[PDB]
Write a protein that binds this ligand. Structure first.
Ligand SMILES: CC(C)(COP(=O)(O)OP(=O)(O)OC[C@H]1O[C@@H](n2cnc3c(N)ncnc32)[C@H](O)[C@@H]1OP(=O)(O)O)[C@@H](O)C(=O)NCCC(=O)NCCSCC(=O)c1ccc(O)cc1O
Ligand SMILES: CC(C)(COP(=O)(O)OP(=O)(O)OC[C@H]1O[C@@H](n2cnc3c(N)ncnc32)[C@H](O)[C@@H]1OP(=O)(O)O)[C@@H](O)C(=O)NCCC(=O)NCCSCC(=O)c1ccc(O)cc1O
Lengths: 137, 137
């Protein structure tokens, strides 16, 4: 696979401890050869004042996924940090939960780029994001 | 002021009820003639696994501010939605609060562009964001 670090879903959902990831109901749901996935609830934790999925929640979901993916691409003595994020909101989400699908675009030695697409519970694309990360040391 | 809607901090902080805005502990601290500002905690609620401020938290604060600012430029009936978000993470923050400052770059009839700068307690710029919005109809 692509990953340098080999971790289980249980282990991934364990780093979440008392952070924003956990705080937002984000759960890592799949780890494939070259893809990381997570789901996140659409309720009062992730709402904006009109009752729709807060665009900021999709963003945070994307930075989470890209960073964790970045982390699993590093050797034992390295850190990975999100440096650059962008996101396009195509469709509102009023109900259910969303799934984020993160895949590599560029896996460099000093920095990387990740794609994260966010789907609603009908598999409809609602948000496209890209995260650039920095590998340190 | 420039806002179509004459609201108050109290009015603004009331909209946060039962949303992601309240969940992240974000509170609007300044409503100026042409500036909106909110503060957000850097604690477990907004941390990432290294005990630093989660980049997605800064993003969520930015989208909150830009959207709220954008609503306040709408005549009754109209709605405002965030469409494009970008964010550059310049500096880590680990404790205290951060402050988001939102100002208009371009106020058009169907499209708006907002700048949100996020500062740490020393007043250093930690994150720069831009939010595109859509007015309808
Ligand atoms: C590391 C850089 C990218 C480059 O550094 P630069 O170009 O040389 O800039 P300078 O070094 O010259 O000065 C900067 C200041 O920073 C300090 N510092 C210094 N060196 C280092 C270092 N090696 N490492 C760290 N800090 C360093 C110094 O105090 C220095 O201050 P000054 O003394 O100069 O006043 C830097 O811009 C940065 O840390 N951005 C923060 C982005 C961020 O936090 N994003 C969100 C969090 S990560 C994603 C996430 O949420 C996530 C992760 C995992 C997961 O599973 C799930 C998740 O969701
Ligand atoms: C409004 C657009 C910008 C126009 O694009 P377009 O040219 O019209 O494209 P289409 O019409 O062809 O798309 C059609 C499909 O999507 C729909 N559709 C369209 N209009 C509506 C509608 N009014 N209602 C429902 N659906 C609509 C239809 O369902 C339709 O279904 P289909 O027929 O396809 O089956 C659009 O890109 C959009 O809504 N993006 C979502 C952004 C977002 O969710 N941001 C995050 C939340 S807001 C910020 C925030 O967090 C925040 C705010 C305030 C605050 O105080 C604090 C805060 O933090």
């Amino acid at each position: 696979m692509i990953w340098k670090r080999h971790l289980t879903l249980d282990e991934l959902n364990a780093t979440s401890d008392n952070t924003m990831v956990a705080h937002l109901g984000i759960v890592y749901t799949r780890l494939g050869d070259d893809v990381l996935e997570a789901e996140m609830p659409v309720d009062t934790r992730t709402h904006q004042p009109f009752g729709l999925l807060h665009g900021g929640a999709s963003a945070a979901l994307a930075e989470t996924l890209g960073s964790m993916a970045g982390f699993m691409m590093t050797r034992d003595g390295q850190c990975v940090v999100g440096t650059e994020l962008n996101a396009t909101h195509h469709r509102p989400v009023s109900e259910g939960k969303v799934r984020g699908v993160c895949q590599p675009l560029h896996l460099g030695r000093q920095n990387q780029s990740w794609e994260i697409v966010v789907f609603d519970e009908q598999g409809r694309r609602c948000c496209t994001c890209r995260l650039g990360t920095a590998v340190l040391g």
